[PDB]
Amino acid sequence: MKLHELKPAEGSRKERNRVGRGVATGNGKTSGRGHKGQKARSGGGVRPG
Amino acid sequence: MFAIIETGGKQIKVEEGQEIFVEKLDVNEGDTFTFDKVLFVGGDSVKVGAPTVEGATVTATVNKQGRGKKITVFTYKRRKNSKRKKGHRQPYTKLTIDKINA
Amino acid sequence: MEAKAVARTIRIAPRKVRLVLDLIRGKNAAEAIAILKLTNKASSPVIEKVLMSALANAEHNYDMNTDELVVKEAYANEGPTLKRFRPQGRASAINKRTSHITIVVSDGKE
Amino acid sequence: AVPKRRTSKTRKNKRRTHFKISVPGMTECPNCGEYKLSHRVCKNCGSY
Amino acid sequence: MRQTFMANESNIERKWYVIDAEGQTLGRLSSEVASILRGKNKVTYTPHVDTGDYVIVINASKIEFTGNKETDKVYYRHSNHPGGIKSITAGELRRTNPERLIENSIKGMLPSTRLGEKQGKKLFVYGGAEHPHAAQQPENYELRG
Amino acid sequence: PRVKGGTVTRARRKKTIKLAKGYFGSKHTLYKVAKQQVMKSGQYAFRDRRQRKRDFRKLWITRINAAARQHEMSYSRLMNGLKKAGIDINRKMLSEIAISDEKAFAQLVTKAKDAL
Amino acid sequence: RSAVSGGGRKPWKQKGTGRARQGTIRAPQWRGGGIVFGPTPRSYAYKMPKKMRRLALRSALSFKAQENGLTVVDAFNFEAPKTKEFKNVLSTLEQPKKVLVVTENEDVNVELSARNIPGVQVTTAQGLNVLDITNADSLVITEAAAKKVEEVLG
RNA sequence: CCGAUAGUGAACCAGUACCGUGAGGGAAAGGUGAAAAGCACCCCGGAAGGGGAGUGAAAUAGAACCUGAAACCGUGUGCUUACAAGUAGUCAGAGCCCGUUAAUGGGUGAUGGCGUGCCUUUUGUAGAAUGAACCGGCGAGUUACGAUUUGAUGCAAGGUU
RNA sequence: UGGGAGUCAGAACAUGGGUGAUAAGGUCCGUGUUCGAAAGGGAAACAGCCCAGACCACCAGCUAAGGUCCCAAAAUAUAUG
RNA sequence: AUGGUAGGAGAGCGUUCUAAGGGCGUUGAAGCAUGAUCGUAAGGACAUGUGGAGCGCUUAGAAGUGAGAAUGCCGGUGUGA
Secondary structure (H helix, E strand, O other), X not given: OOHHHOOOOOOOOOOOOOOOOOOOOOOOXXXXXXXXXXXXXXXXXXXXX | OEEEEEXXXXXXXXXXXXXXXXXXXXXXXXXXXXXXXXXXXXOOOOEEOOOOOOOOOEEEEEEEEEEOOOEEEEEEEOOOOEEEEEEEOOEEEEEEEEEEOO | OEEEEEEEEEOOOHHHHXXXXXXXXXXXXXXXXXXXXXXXXXXXXHHHHHHHXXXXXXXXXXXXXXXXXXXXXXXXXXXXXXXXXEOOOOOEEEEEOOEEEEEEEEOOOO | OOOOOOOOHHHHHHHOOOOOOOOOOOOXXXXXXXXXXXXXXXXXXXXX | OOOOOOOOOOOOOOOEEEEOXXXXXXXXXXXXXXXXXXXXXXXXXXOOOOXXXXXXXXXXXXXXXXOOOOOOOEEEEEOOOOOOEEEEEHHHHHHOOHHHHHHHHHHHHOOOOHHHHHHHOOEXXXXXXXXXXXXXXXXXXXXXX | OOOOOOOHHHHHHHHHHHHOOOOOHHHHOOHHXXXXXXXXXXXXXXXXXXXXXXXXXXXXXXXXXXHHHHOOXXXXXXXXXXXXXXXXXXXXXXXXXXXHOHHHHHHHHHHHHHOO | OOOOOOOXXXXXXXXXXXXXXXXXXXOOOOOOOOOOOOOOOOOOXXXXXXXXXXXXXXXXXXXXXXXXXXXXXXXXXXXXXXXXXXXXXXXXXXXXXXXXXXXXOOOHHHHHHHHOOOOEEEEEOOOOOHHHHHOOOEEEEEHXXXXXXXXXXX
């Protein structure tokens, strides 16, 4: 192949999901966390078990 | 003299030499189109079709298969982070009438 | 034919200079000079200096006659301000403002 | 005691329409020198 | 925007009509008068321009009420002073300034816009059978039942 | 590597400012209140594109009622007669015929009448 | 914010009088500094299986051979380094601008001859790599080097 | 990896002006031009400033010196406005002026219809609930290690360092 | 079967009930609808009521709930009280 | 079939940098300003002025990758006048 004609295998690569970057993503304001509570908070969540 | 034609889903009032704009047709520029659904014919004599007049065509010559001016469709819901922005350009075809038969 | 003069960084506020500038715009030079002599405002002699400089420029550099001239444009623009912490009051700030004055004078032809 | 809304340019310049200087009289000195101030023997060549 | 006619000045011609209020009912006269004044009777009606004709009402004292509206049916107004509300009955207003009665009844049926005020300025209402506006050559108009 | 916020903010805001041309005062100079108005403007236009058709049908019907009451006929009875006689003609074309050629309008009012 | 100089004390009282509540002048919303999630010193290298590595090399060479971009010669007889003579050699052999030349083990003379020419690269059979194979448009080998790569990849 | 609000607190006068009794805290501030050739001389003016002339490729490159955005302040004009109730726009629409990336064009808008900003928090907000004077810039799910599960590829009773 | 969530403040209307005083835009359960998260037409204006669920154009047409004197589209319609 | 908030899935536009290839530029690059242009959207060109040296395009790859709100921080500038 050529370095200027490089192409990965189909299905090998996806773009990551970037949170907190506007409304039209569907991940903008709350960033998937919902509104309030212990899990909305940074470092929040409750330990496993 | 003048005539009421039906094209698209609407009715248009035409005279000879008149330019009209109409929903898109399946013809090309320079060609000749014939409207067959005529409802009314005026002038000296008058003809009133019940639906139509049993004949009574209108010939015209095609120009400018084109697209209309862009409109930007915008909507939003105020307190809810929901909006939509779209564009639209409606197609048209221009014609020049040359003769109306009755 | 237009002759112009500008005075930059005058220690007077544009709001104050424009009041007297509004009287002389569109006038003849002699009557404008008279108005400026008869107005008692701080900016009158400054504007007089600028006007006479413009007329001298017309007479020397362009060889126009000063008897048939009129003030065509006359304006003041803002220059850079100077900040001063007023000690007399209670820790307030005071902007000393300044103006760029311009007048241009013409014979009315081409 | 304090303004609840800022003042727009329109309102400001409407209020500033009567805030200007009148024109003096300027009776032209018939005697000599610069033009005299009316009813004033002006220091700068007036003869009223 | 295909073809639809739009009247303007240099297209429209206003006329002059005379209506006799004798033996007529107030509101039933005033509705028709408002329609004439606004131009609903015309085929060139456009709402953003004063298509419409002039109207003259003449007698205005033979105007009739039904029921006990002569003593009931009180008109009110307020001076924008405290307790500055004032009243008057329709019979009193009929035998005293009956022109104001009809003109207010018709201006209530017209809208409160600029065009509506201009259209109400086209109403001339008198008391008695004589009017001055003979120079305009008015036609008599009969009311529809 | 670092990427700084260059020229895209300015372009994005500027074209909104340009859409806000002709507005009153700060609404053609300031990005926030200009943007707020443009959104509102588009919503208004969306609903007015639909109000337009209602308004014009209303106009045509008023004109036809006027034209019929000269021939001593109401809109309602005229259109019932038209429907019964078969006429499938628009209210718009009817209005324009009534304005242009009164004679033809009378001629089909006769048909609307004799179909009853 | 912990590595930025200063920022120890709280710049004003929690309630203040009419101000926003703050804790240090080196917080990230301050002009002074404090980066939240920036780059960190790290490595990007990763590994994959030896079989895949060998397969990639074989596929590169097979592409270069089926594109008619493979040339094989006898030995290079360079008793001294001469970029000019190597240029004439690559003129005689109708080679493109980008060419990779593969010796068996090491020839300092031909290396020095071809070092300064643009587009040309010199490599050993053991030191072959997919990158400098694919970047090239042609591949000249000595017979010994060809046999060596054949045995170590077969 | 940063490229002057970044990157050392500090590209320059830096742990300096400045604050604090003291321990201590702690800034802002880069760019003429290839070359100083850095405006001889004349004119207005007390001078500052300027107008010519001249150097220069260029002086709206003149030391408050590359580029020079917006807020903000003005001067001129084409359309418009002193009987009018206003979330200031939108759809319709005369009249007047202009003439484009030339396409069923542009600017203004007599008049008619419709129409209570945005964000957050809420059962529910035009809300007299919160926040924003305006403008610009900066400003928030990242990296390492491990687990789990999906997709890709290689090999396969073996696979892998 | 597995990967990823958010939610655990609910409101009115109608109907079956407790409580209260056969009071509450009250409160607590149950059965449906709507709002929440739903624009449009009607109810003068009015989240929750009636009609009905907006992919986008059109100066085309048929209807729903509600209506046809003027504001303001459509009967100053017919017939009987 | 296509109303939609917590939220799940998918496809894309732009920003800085790197590799390779292929290009533009004192016969004037990027930036800035204007415009009646193109695209379903993010957004992309062209022309003319200003400016006076660097910058696009294709494919892939990495991120300090997109702000209108935090009594946010820093600078300029208003209002009250």
